[PDB]
Amino acid sequence: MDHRTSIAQAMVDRISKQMDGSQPDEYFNNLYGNVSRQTYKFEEIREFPYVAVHIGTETGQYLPSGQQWMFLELPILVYDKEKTDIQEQLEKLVADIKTVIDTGGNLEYTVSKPNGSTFPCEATDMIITSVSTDEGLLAPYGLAEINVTVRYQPPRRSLRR
Amino acid sequence: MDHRTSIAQAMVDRISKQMDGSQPDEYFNNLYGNVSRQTYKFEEIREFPYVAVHIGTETGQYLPSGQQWMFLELPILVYDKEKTDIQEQLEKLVADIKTVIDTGGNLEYTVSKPNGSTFPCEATDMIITSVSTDEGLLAPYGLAEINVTVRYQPPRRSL
Amino acid sequence: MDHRTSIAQAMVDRISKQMDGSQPDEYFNNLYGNVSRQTYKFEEIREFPYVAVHIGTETGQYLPSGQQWMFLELPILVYDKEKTDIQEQLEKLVADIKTVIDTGGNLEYTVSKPNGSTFPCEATDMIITSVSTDEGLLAPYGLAEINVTVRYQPPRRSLRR
Amino acid sequence: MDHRTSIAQAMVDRISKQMDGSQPDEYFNNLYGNVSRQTYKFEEIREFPYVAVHIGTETGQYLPSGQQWMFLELPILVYDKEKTDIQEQLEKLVADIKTVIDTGGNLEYTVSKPNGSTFPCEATDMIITSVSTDEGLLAPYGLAEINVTVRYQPPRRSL
Amino acid sequence: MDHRTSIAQAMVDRISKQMDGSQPDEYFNNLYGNVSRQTYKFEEIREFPYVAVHIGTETGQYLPSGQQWMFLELPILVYDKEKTDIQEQLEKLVADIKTVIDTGGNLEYTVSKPNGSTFPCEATDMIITSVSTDEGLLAPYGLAEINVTVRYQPPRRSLRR
Amino acid sequence: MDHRTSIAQAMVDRISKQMDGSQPDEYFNNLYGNVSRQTYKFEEIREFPYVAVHIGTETGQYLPSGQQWMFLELPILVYDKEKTDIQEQLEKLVADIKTVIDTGGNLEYTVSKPNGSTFPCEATDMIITSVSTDEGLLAPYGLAEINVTVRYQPPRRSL
């Protein structure tokens, strides 16, 4: 069950593939290559136009058929040095992230079975909750927080002991 | 979608063009020219009669046709020095700003399409939430908080 | 709209005029002249039997006819030195304040039309909320916190562009 | 209206008169004389068996005939030293106070009209809420909180 | 009314008599003699396997027949000192306390009428709420908090002035 | 009643026995030996495939036949020490722990009667609530919080 790290990896891979070096229309920040989940915080992060994917808490409920409903959360932060205008650039980055989340397809999985092979699976639904930004201080830099939720269905490894 | 800073720019342009040096009746602050969002806080801003717009969190809901609804928030701050009575000037500014927000039409809007041109759009509705007031301390200056919410439809639909 | 400072000025004028030098019956503080809103805090205020009104937050709701309902709140404090006793004399003050607020008529307005003349208006209702009291410390002095709410109808400057 | 200080004074007079040197049955603290509201806190109060009555926030509601309903609050504090047990003496004082509040009639009242005479009145009903006490520290003395509510009708009506 | 320390003393006497030096089945701590309410806190308490009962707040509601329903709370604490295992011994003691409270009879009373004699009474019900356990720190010692509630009927000393 | 420490022993024994050096399929942590409750905190624990089980507050309700219902809470913490990804190893551990909690039967139980013998019993149902994750700081190590609830009936009835 869980699949949390696999979900994060699929998310960052989807952002990278669908955002980089293609389709000037629709999506436009042209991240050459960057986005990841292993390296974050602030210190380090020597480049700009970088966006980070965090890991958050989850919630769970039990349905009376062995099916599992699991709610998962992913905080997303965006950084941009100045260029034209902190507000404009942060809003443009968050808009591109949002459209990549929404308009194209369902989320994909690359789970690894116990000491076996990878069996791809899908993700039921995706919802983007409130998205906030930083304040005036730390003037030349800027932040953009994104709160997104994922609802996956774990494999029913029940009723099969 | 998103489309926040353009909401801010549209509101700033509307307040600036609607308040400046025209219509002596109805509107009474006569800002020569001023209102912006790039520069705020308190430091700098060497004039008074200065009103500022902030940008804050917005929340969204998913209607079952691919349609989007998003409620956005803007804090408004007003400063004034003392020509006569600080409370009177503050309420004067707040009344004028509320009038300009409410009475005239929907907001004009200036989206910027990917690597293309600007296609004008609208803003659904305007709502004025609580109006706070500053305190006695920092005597010669004064503040007047305004809470306003915006609800726009983002010009895009899901699969 | 608003009319907030006009409301405060009208209420303080009502208190001062209706409370001073007249009607020994039903009213007993006989304030020579004092009640105001511009000067408060504690420092200054060299006299006593002084009473001050503050300015507080407001709340607004929109009715589907262009009519506006705005709730306005006014915190009022009373300062009084000694004499007979702090408790009874402060409560005598606040009892006079309550009776002058409730008993006699609705409010009056002296609002200002944009670059024009003053057109008087009325205020719908007054409701008096909790009335707190100070504590033992600062012994020779005492406070009396009284909170009042005002429900006015702003001029319908809508449907007329 | 308001009238709360006279409510407190009447309650103090009632406890003093009903508790002192009379009726060995029912009431057992035999307070010779003490109970007041002018002097409290802890400092001073050199004797013991003292009990104090405070003054607190009140709330009001408007019925549609000009009638007024106002709920009031009185914190009550009891102190005891150590003849035998601090807990026992505290509960004995608390039980006697609750009995005197509950069993006997409505409260008497002594309003003073504006520059006139004293016209006695009544008090509608008595309600006593949670009863808490002190902790281990400050060992030789003891405390016992009493929370009571008062609901009076103000002898006046609106327009 | 009240009768609070009557409840506390009856409870502690019940624990003592029903728990000490008898019935090696069912009840298993063999507290030789100890349990009390006057002495607590931590400092002092030189023995061990000691249990202390506190006094807490109460709550009261009024029924329209002169009957009073009063809720009273009693926090209970236990202390133990190594021997086998802290967790085991603490839950050993708390299981004994819980079964003594629950399985055997209703509470008794030794209340005192004004300057008279003792007329025993009863207590309607007992409920035992959440039971917390202490943490690793202060290693050789350990706590296990018990929160119980009682619901007695105060004597209807109303309608009889 | 109560019975918490034996619940903890049953949980630790079950995880240890279902976890060690058997069934390469399904279960992939191969913990040689670790899980316990006597030693925890962080200090000590010089190995870091370790998993710890805590003890928490429980709540009870009274059904009207003398039957008792008790909901118990168990915080579970997992540590790990690199070798590839901290996040990946933590999620693998959490998935394996959730699997072992859910898939196999009700919990076995080993109550000890007063000065008697051990009579095995059962545990009604297992529920796993929210699962938290650690933070960036303290980089080379990792945390993985698990919160589970236990609902056992006490093998005794009231009068």
Residue numbers in the entry:
A (entry chain C), C (entry chain A), E (entry chain E): 1 to 161
B (entry chain B), D (entry chain F), F (entry chain D): 1 to 159
Cite, word for word, the article reporting this structure.
Using the local reconstruction method, we then obtained the structures of the connector complex and the portal of mature T5 at resolutions of 4.8 and 3.2 Å, respectively. We also built an atomic model of T5 terminator protein p142, including all 161 amino acid residues. Each p142 contains two α-helices and a β-barrel structure facing the lumen of the tube, which are homologous to the terminator proteins of other phages, such as Lambda (gpU) and SPP1 (gp17). The pairwise interfaces between the protein components of the T5 connector complex and the TTP are complementary in terms of electrostatic potential energy. In the mature state, the negative electrostatic potential inside the connector channel and TMP collectively prevent the release of DNA.
In this study, we used cryo-electron microscopy (cryo-EM) to determine the structures of mature T5 (a laboratory-adapted, fiberless T5 mutant) and urea-treated empty T5 (lacking the tip complex) at near-atomic resolutions. The T5 head comprises 775 copies of MCP gp8, arranged into 11 pentons and 120 hexons, forming an icosahedral shell with a triangle number (T) of 13.
